Design a protein around this ligand. Structure first.
Ligand SMILES: Nc1ncnc2c1ncn2[C@@H]1O[C@H](COP(=O)(O)OP(=O)(O)O)[C@@H](O)[C@H]1O
Ligand SMILES: Nc1ncnc2c1ncn2[C@@H]1O[C@H](COP(=O)(O)OP(=O)(O)O)[C@@H](O)[C@H]1O
Ligand SMILES: [Zn+2]
Ligand SMILES: [Zn+2]
Ligand SMILES: [Zn+2]
Lengths: 637, 281, 408, 380
């Protein structure tokens, strides 16, 4: 038959299951795999099928738009009975592969076809009963990953009253099937699974959690469970952010009906395909801004525009958001790429609200507070698997912030042990643990922005920094940029700052309606920022993904002599631990400035901005009697 | 074979449908509103329910609410087929009713066994909440000896297999196959509310209670909030009654333990000038 | 039909000749003289002797290895009769091993080869191998060799038989835990752990922390919705190219060998020749000596980096992790005495308490890199003292005491 | 990319089976160990460093000369044809370019014959390219962002195969041989080709081969091969075509706009079909909700203005009534939600409407605009 499947006698399940309809659509599918209208590109699916047999894999990715364009209802049935359509599609794919590579059944049992480019995406907080048993696409973060264990797929039983073997039953991973009547005896006696004639599969259970920046205000992170089957295991590891398409089904049947009031179940997602990406309109719009002369000062002026002054601090925020190049030098050597920033100064200087801005701007940000965070809660935690009863590990704040930023407020006031665990993260970008038989290391690639207070709550400008804080040279060494803040008094400084703040509360105060009000918001962005904020978030994301500026050793004398000069002036003065790690900040912060222009080369100008920022930091954090002398000693730089 | 008919329930449903067709028809506009917006639950103000027959309709509905619920469910879902049959469709007849705006707001301090089965509203501070889960509101089974199908297998507060195969040609009992597609499920959530600080006198201690939320009314409970619920009180089996003093009744042996719980169908939280002004006389 | 399999095995033992000798007949005869009822069959000789039985054994060993046990028992008893129990089969093989992560739902009931390190072992337990029973109703007697007792008498009611204890035979069994080498595990992943079982002469050969090569059968057993726990029936456990030997011998013959390797250690860093050279001494380590009284001198070389921050001291430890074949890296803060040293935990798979090693147990025979050594607690330091100066870890938890060696 | 080595594959009985097998699966292949490769490397150095293009040559309607472009990039191009009926008087000005061109044409012409003999089944065109009858275009970029190009020839030759993308190519020691549209068109379905991406500022010389351009594209059509190349050059260089071919450029550019709305209609059908089945009711969703999903399917930004183009071409396409919120909507017109036969019929309906409307525009004597005007929904 053909085009007769469009008749809707009943619900879609009542129609697909009919064998005459099944043969029709199976025949209909067979045409799509062998032939598709991709103009000059030919039937790429035939190439996909041909190359898969060459590669000896089971991953036939199928674009949703291709089937939707050619076969209307044949694709829409997949959006309401995905399990039924995928059941026959595997068989249709199986014969199609054997046309190009026969005897594929000899080594491979089935073709686990993969749906891709499905246009409807739901978050973990959107799933409802109305979307049950459908095909859904969600995006999340892998928090906890279980092991790989076999699971039954086709089950056969042996009757205890006869030697006959019961027929095969497909294991839906929904209920532990228990038959009640033998085919021969019709008796209700005992049954046992015939292991020698039972087909298994690979089963792994993985937890997906909302992205750190997407959690709604004032709620715990919503998270679900995902079922990976058929070689879909080990696709992701803790800390990775993935998007997955699967079937939303219910399988928790058991003591939940009685152990909790009334019969209830729990929901899972059976994953079909998973993926761990810019149109021309975006990149073409970026390059217009990219060619603007002097773009660096545009980005810095746009770092939290509603904060007056603090330009030598906003540049540290700007440089840390873009980051550097995590140069895995020759593989055998590694250097961190992200820029660490420490904000220190008197109360009333917005050392915290900036960290309430980095959270909303960086792609992935995790916020923490000094006394409200524990050593176990930051690095990693220990759990027992509710299914396999094994020791499992769960990622902390640093593990979540992988390829992101970690924001710690009141860094000094936390206890010493909670502050101690941070040491490894700031240099290794990894969490090393040895607890309850777990010996492993995680990925913790994240910049750390820390706010603190000096001893006594006020900064003593007549004393060195190493004496003004309770921290020590080691902890200060892992930082790149230190932003000392003085709340000194001056009428001219106060008038400028106050007249900025008093206007900030005028605008942040409240007062095609969507378009009209969205126009108003970007209008106020233009009042205060040279860059629209939405683009800047994307611009940072685009720079972090595509731009990796390279180096030429032309300015070697400029940097080396600066390094020697800074070391000489710190030989006998209580100051920063100026070491090799402090030199690396100059080069990495130069990479950020180069990576702001989207250039591929570290120019002389980029180091000029880099050296000025780094040297000024060391000069500013000195006692008054010595500060004025180094002011003139480094005037060359 | 004719089953016993509840004449009081039939009178209630007849008064129920008559109230629906006559109240001004804003509720039918809501019914059409649900069809337009693909909604599951209809909401009814109690004071709107209590302004017919001088409120005597509400009184019978209130004090024996758990008994009379199916009649009102039939009363409305007949009306939906009368005026919005598309809501009966799927891709099946899920329908809910959630009342609100009760006059009395009883405290956790004031739970009495007399209130079991009656409609009441309470207020208490949330301390813990549970993750949402699907609840087997109505199930269906297919036979095992033969292949007959049994539909509309309701599960009232417990798992319940069908007690017979409907066709006399089969003798199957206590052996059934559970359908997971023709069957239906509904959302479910538990909320652990606490007596307010202003209720407990000094020296006294706060009482605690567990409240059940189902339907779209879930997830409208957040820790630390002063929530307000509306529903009926229902008892559930308990396992901590062992070891208590006094003679305990027995079934014949089988146990008959119980503990008090409250089931809520509506959720609201206690807290723009003109919005506030029009709420006062 | 299966008699040919027995006959082929008999030729492969009595008549198989290598090095102009009946090696399998002689080694089995020597085992009989030793009274060790086991035979070590080399799989590389089996494939060279008869490929047809190899096809059956590799594909369906369900009936072949029962035939192995009974055929060897008959042949060995024949040798014993000629010269003047069930003989255990031991398999030695050099075929390629399958990675532990590569085990899937397809190698079920297939003989596979693995390599890894034992992380925990169990206590011995006795399992039945031969039974004799008597009917309680009518005293009817019979012998029985999973296995379950008959439901009805052969002469009485349901389950009429009882076990005759004094005329029954049992064998010992042990349960082992195996996991892959952590060096082969990419970061962000906990090494997969696999349960293994061994019986009779194969028991108690390996302690936790021992690296082994495995030849066994991949299978599952019930103990999720239908998640059966995989397990291995152990069949044989073992614990450089000629041109590589010449290549490394030439490296030993290099006149600047010491300085070249000294420079090779962390070449990205500048100078620091002295600390490089000491770490080179750490890689080789000392040579072991044993006192005439039985005590052992600790051969490990332990070095402490105790300088100013920002001197690449952290980077020095990281490079060693990538050069030491057995390498474990852990921080002082994120470690515990139970996590570092050994511990006792109950295995949920067999419902028994197992002795389980820790980080300092895994690094046995290699090098461990601990960072922020000052930041760990004294109890962790105290346990390190025993490992540093005695190469042992003493465990006393719950109600059991034990001592475990650690050459870390 | 397949590699052809003259040390083992240089005879016709060796090359032809290899070329035929390569072109049945691929469109690009490499030439290795050519005797002129060493000379070509030296000649390339002379051109890129000493023999700079004649920037004063200017540019003409024949798309030959030294065209100035953006970023001070210069393109030195020449065209040669055996048939004198086409006035390619602007021959190559630099002899070193001719030295490479002669060396490329020495073996490339035989390889071009091999490509035609491999996949083209037309017996009349077995020797359509030869010494007596050939047409070649010499192309040279120059600098004083990959550009997607598709040569219309039979075979295209590059002296160096580096920084060329289709995945990039990193084989400088092998010459690049890529097939054009004409070979695929005359292959009768046995071989197909794809466009390439190259750096426009890498100073790379390239060569493309045709039979004499006076030869028609096919016996089934009236236009000649020169017309096909002219269309490609008009599309590639609007600034040059503005002086000489204003109306032709407008006609050619309008075809891409037609493909835009056709695929836009296809996406709307898929999106609206999912929206109907995801709800128990047929209430039309507001337009602003659908647009983010529409643009994701289109893989480029789509706004209300582009959607309104569909209404202009096909008025019965959708129902776009304005919601009480004041927000535009869209929905399927068919009373019964959807039928797979009606979906194709409506898709064909828009195709017929657009194609007829395209022909109406090109038949008008007025100069042609290259976009579809937007429809105006009745304001309320
Ligand atoms: N430079 C500044 N510009 C504008 N507002 C500021 C500035 N410094 C401080 N403030 C105001 O003072 C408050 C400081 O808050 P917080 O960041 O907690 O201070 P601390 O520096 O003690 O962390 C903010 O609400 C901010 O509005
Ligand atoms: N001699 C050196 N050569 C090269 N890099 C060095 C040298 N000394 C220090 N470094 C730099 O110091 C960093 C490692 O410092 P680290 O030991 O982590 O500091 P800490 O002692 O605070 O842990 C590396 O990034 C490395 O580049
Ligand atoms: Zn039976
Ligand atoms: Zn029946
Ligand atoms: Zn008996």
């Amino acid at each position: 038959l053909e085009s007769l499947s469009n008749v809707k006698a009943n619900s879609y399940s009542e129609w697909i299951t009919q064998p005459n309809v099944s043969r029709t659509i199976a025949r209909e599918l067979k045409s799509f795999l062998l032939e598709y209208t991709d103009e000059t590109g030919r039937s790429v699916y035939g190439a996909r099928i041909r190359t898969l047999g060459e590669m000896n894999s089971e991953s036939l990715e199928v674009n949703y738009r291709h089937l939707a364009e050619s076969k209307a209802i044949l694709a829409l049935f997949l959006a309401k009975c995905p399990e039924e359509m995928l059941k026959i599609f595997d068989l249709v794919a199986m014969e199609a592969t054997e046309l190009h590579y026969p005897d594929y059944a000899r080594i491979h049992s089935e073709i686990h076809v993969r749906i891709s480019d499905f246009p409807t995406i739901y978050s973990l907080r959107e799933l409802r009963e109305s979307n049950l048993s459908s095909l859904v696409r969600v995006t999340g973060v892998v928090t906890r990953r279980t092991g790989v264990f076999p699971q039954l797929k086709y089950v056969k039983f042996n009757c205890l009253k006869c030697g006959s073997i019961l027929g095969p039953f497909f294991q839906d991973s929904n209920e532990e099937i228990r038959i009640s009547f033998c085919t021969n005896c019709k008796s209700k006696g005992p049954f046992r699974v015939n292991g020698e004639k039972t087909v298994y599969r690979n089963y792994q259970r993985v937890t997906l959690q909302e992205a750190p920046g997407t959690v709604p205000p004032g709620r715990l992170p919503r998270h679900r469970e995902v079922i990976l089957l058929a070689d879909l295991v080990d696709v992701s590891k803790p800390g990775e952010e993935v998007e997955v398409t699967g079937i939303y089904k219910n399988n928790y049947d058991g003591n939940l009906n009685a152990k909790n009031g009334f019969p209830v179940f729990a929901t899972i997602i059976e994953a079909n395909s998973i993926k761990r990406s810019w149109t021309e309109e975006e990149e073409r719009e970026f390059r217009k801004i990219s060619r603007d002369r002097g773009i660096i000062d545009k980005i810095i002026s746009s770092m939290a525009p509603s904060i007056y002054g603090h330009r030598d601090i906003k540049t540290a925020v700007a440089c840390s958001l873009f980051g550097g190049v995590p140069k895995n030098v020759n593989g055998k050597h590694s250097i961190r790429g992200d820029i660490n920033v420490l904000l220190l100064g008197d109360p009333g200087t917005a050392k915290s609200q900036i960290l309430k801005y980095v959270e909303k701007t960086a792609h992935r940000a995790v916020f923490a507070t000094g006394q409200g965070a524990s050593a176990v809660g930051l690095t990693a935690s220990v759990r027992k698997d509710p299914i396999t009863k094994e020791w499992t590990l769960e990622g902390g704040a640093l593990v979540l912030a992988d390829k992101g930023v970690c924001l710690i407020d009141e860094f000094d006031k936390m206890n010493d042990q909670d502050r101690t665990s941070i040491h490894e993260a700031m240099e290794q970008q990894s969490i090393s643990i040895s607890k309850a038989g777990i010996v492993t290391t995680l990925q913790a690639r994240c910049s750390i922005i820390a706010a603190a207070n000096p001893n006594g709550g006020r900064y003593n400008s007549t004393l060195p920094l190493a004496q003004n804080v309770s921290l020590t040279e080691p902890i200060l060494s892992r930082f790149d940029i230190l932003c000392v803040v003085r709340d000194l008094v001056d009428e001219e400084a106060d008038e400028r700052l106050a007249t900025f703040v008093v206007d900030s509360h005028v605008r942040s105060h409240p007062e095609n309606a969507r378009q009209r009000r969205l126009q108003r918001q970007r209008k106020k962005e233009e009042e205060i920022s040279p860059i629209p904020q939405e683009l800047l978030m994307k611009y940072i994301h685009y720079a972090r993904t595509k731009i990796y500026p390279k180096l030429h050793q032309m300015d070697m004398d400029k940097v080396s002599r600066v390094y020697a000069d800074l070391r000489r002036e710190s030989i006998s003065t209580g100051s920063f631990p100026i070491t090799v790690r402090h030199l690396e900040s100059i080069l990495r912060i130069a990479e950020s400035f180069a990576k702001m222009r989207l250039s591929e080369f570290v120019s002389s100008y980029d180091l000029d901005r880099a050296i000025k920022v780094v040297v000024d930091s060391f000069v500013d954090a000195q006692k008054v009697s010595v500060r004025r002398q180094l002011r003139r000693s480094f005037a060359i730089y | 074979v004719k089953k016993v008919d509840d004449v009081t329930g039939e009178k209630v449903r007849e008064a129920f449908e008559q109230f629906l067709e006559d109240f001004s028809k804003v509720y039918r506009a809501q019914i059409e509103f649900m069809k337009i917006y693909d909604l599951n639950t209809i909401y009814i103000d109690y004071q709107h329910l209590s302004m017919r027959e001088n409120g005597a309709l509400a009184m019978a509905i209130s004090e024996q609410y758990y008994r009379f619920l199916p009649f009102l469910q039939k009363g409305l879902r007949r009306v939906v087929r009368k005026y919005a049959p598309e809501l009966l469709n799927t891709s099946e007849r899920v329908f809910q009713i959630s009342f609100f705006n009760l006059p009395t707001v009883h405290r956790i301090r004031d739970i009495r066994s007399e209130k079991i089965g009656s409609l009441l509203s309470i207020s208490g501070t949330v301390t813990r909440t549970s993750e949402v889960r699907p609840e087997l509101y109505k199930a269906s089974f297919t036979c095992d000896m033969c292949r007959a199908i049994v539909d509309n297998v309701e599960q009232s507060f417990k798992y319940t297999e069908p007690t017979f195969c409907p066709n006399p040609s089969c003798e199957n009992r206590a052996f059934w196959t559970l359908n997971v597609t023709r069957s239906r499920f509904l959302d479910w959530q538990k909320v652990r509310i606490q007596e307010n600080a202003n209720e407990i006198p000094t020296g006294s201690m706060p009482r605690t209670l567990d409240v059940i939320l189902r339907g779209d009314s879930v997830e409208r409970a957040k820790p630390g909030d002063r929530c307000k619920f509306t529903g009926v009180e229902i008892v559930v089996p308990d396992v901590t009654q062992l070891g208590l003093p006094g003679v305990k009744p027995s079934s014949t042996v089988r146990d008959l333990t119980y503990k008090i719980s409250f089931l809520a169908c509506h959720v609201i939280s206690i807290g723009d000038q003109e919005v506030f002004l029009n709420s006062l006389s | 039909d299966n008699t040919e399999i027995i006959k082929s095995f008999k030729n492969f033992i009595l008549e198989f000749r290598l090095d102009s000798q009946f090696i399998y007949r002689d080694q089995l005869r020597n085992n009989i003289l030793v009274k060790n009822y086991s035979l070590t069959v080399n799989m590389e000789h089996l494939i060279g002797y008869n490929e047809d039985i190899y096809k059956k054994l590799s594909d369906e060993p369900s009936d072949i290895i029962p035939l192995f046990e009974t055929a060897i028992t008959q042949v060995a008893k024949r040798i014993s009769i000629l010269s003047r129990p069930t003989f255990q089969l031991i398999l030695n093989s050099n075929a390629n091993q399958i990675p532990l992560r590569d085990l899937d739902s397809e190698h079920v009931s297939k003989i596979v080869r693995l390599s890894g390190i034992i992380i925990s072992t169990s206590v011995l337990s006795s399992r039945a191998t031969y039974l004799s029973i008597m009917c309680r109703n009518c005293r009817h007697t019979t012998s029985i060799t999973t296995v379950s007792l008959p439901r009805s008498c052969l002469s009485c009611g349901p389950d009429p038989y009882i076990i005759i204890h004094e005329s029954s035979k049992f064998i010992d069994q042990q349960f082992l835990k195996l996991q892959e080498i952590p060096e082969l595990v990419p970061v962000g992943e906990m090494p997969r752990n696999l349960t293994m079982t061994c019986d009779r002469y194969l028991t108690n050969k390996v302690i936790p922390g021992t690296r082994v090569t495995i030849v066994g059968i991949y299978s599952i057993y019930n103990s999720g919705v239908a998640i059966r726990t995989p397990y291995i029936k152990i069949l044989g456990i073992q614990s450089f190219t000629e041109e590589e030997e010449e290549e490394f011998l030439q490296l030993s013959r290099n006149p600047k060998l010491y300085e070249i390797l000294t420079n090779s250690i962390a070449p990205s860093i500048f100078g620091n020749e002295d600390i490089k050279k000491a770490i080179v001494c750490l890689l080789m380590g000392g040579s072991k000596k044993i006192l005439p009284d039985g005590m052992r001198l600790r051969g490990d070389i332990n070095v402490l980096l105790l300088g100013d921050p920002g001197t690449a001291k952290s980077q020095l430890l990281k490079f060693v992790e990538k050069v030491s074949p057995i390498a474990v890296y852990t921080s002082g803060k994120g470690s515990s005495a139970a996590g570092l040293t050994a511990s006792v935990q109950r295995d949920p798979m067999t419902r028994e308490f197992y002795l389980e090693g820790g980080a300092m147990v895994l690094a046995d025979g290699g090098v461990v890199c601990i960072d922020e050594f000052d930041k760990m607690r004294d109890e962790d330091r105290v346990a390190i003292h025993e490992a540093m100066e005695q190469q042992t870890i003493s465990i006393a938890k719950a109600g059991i005491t034990t001592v475990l060696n650690s050459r870390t | 990319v397949p590699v052809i080595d003259l040390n083992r594959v240089s005879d016709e009985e060796q090359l032809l089976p290899v070329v035929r097998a390569i072109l049945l699966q691929h469109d690009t292949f490499l030439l290795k160990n050519y005797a002129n490769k060493a000379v070509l490397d030296a000649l390339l150095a002379g051109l890129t460093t000493k023999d700079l293009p004649d920037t004063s040559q200017g540019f003409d309607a024949n798309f030959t000369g030294t065209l100035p472009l953006e970023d001070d990039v210069w393109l030195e191009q020449y065209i040669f044809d055996t048939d004198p009926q086409l006035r390619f008087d602007r021959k190559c000005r630099n002899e070193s370019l001719c030295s490479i061109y002669s060396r490329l044409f020495k073996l490339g012409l035989f390889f071009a014959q091999l490509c035609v003999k491999s996949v083209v089944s037309s017996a009349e065109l077995q020797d359509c390219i030869s010494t007596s009858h050939y047409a070649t275009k010499l192309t040279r970029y120059f600098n004083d962002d990959y550009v997607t190009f598709l040569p219309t020839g039979v075979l295209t030759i590059f002296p160096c195969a580096k920084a060329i993308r289709y995945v990039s190519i990193d084989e400088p020691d092998c010459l690049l041989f890529h097939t054009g549209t004409l070979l695929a068109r005359w292959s009768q379905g046995m071989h197909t080709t794809s466009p390439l991406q190259i750096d426009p500022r890498a100073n790379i010389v390239s060569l493309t081969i045709w039979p004499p351009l006076t030869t028609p594209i096919s016996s089934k059509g009236e236009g000649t091969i020169a017309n096909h190349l002219l269309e490609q050059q008009i599309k590639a260089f609007p600034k040059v075509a503005q002086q000489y071919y204003p109306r032709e450029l407008s006609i050619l550019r309008l075809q891409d706009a037609m493909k835009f709305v056709k695929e836009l209609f296809t996406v709307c059908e898929t999106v609206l079909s999912l929206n109907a089945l995801s709800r128990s009711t047929g209430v039309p969703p507001e337009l602003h909700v659908l647009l983010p999903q529409i643009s994701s399917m289109m893989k480029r930004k789509i706004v209300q203005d582009d959607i309104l183009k569909l209404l202009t071409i096909w008025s019965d396409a959708y129902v776009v009534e304005l919601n009480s919120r004041g927000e535009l909507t869209m929905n399927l017109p068919k009373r019964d939600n959807l039928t797979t036969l009606t979906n194709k019929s409506r898709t064909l309906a828009f195709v017929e409407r657009a194609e007829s409307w395209y022909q109406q525009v090109i038949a008008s004597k007025d100069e042609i605009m290259t976009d579809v005007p937007a429809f105006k929904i009745n304001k309320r």
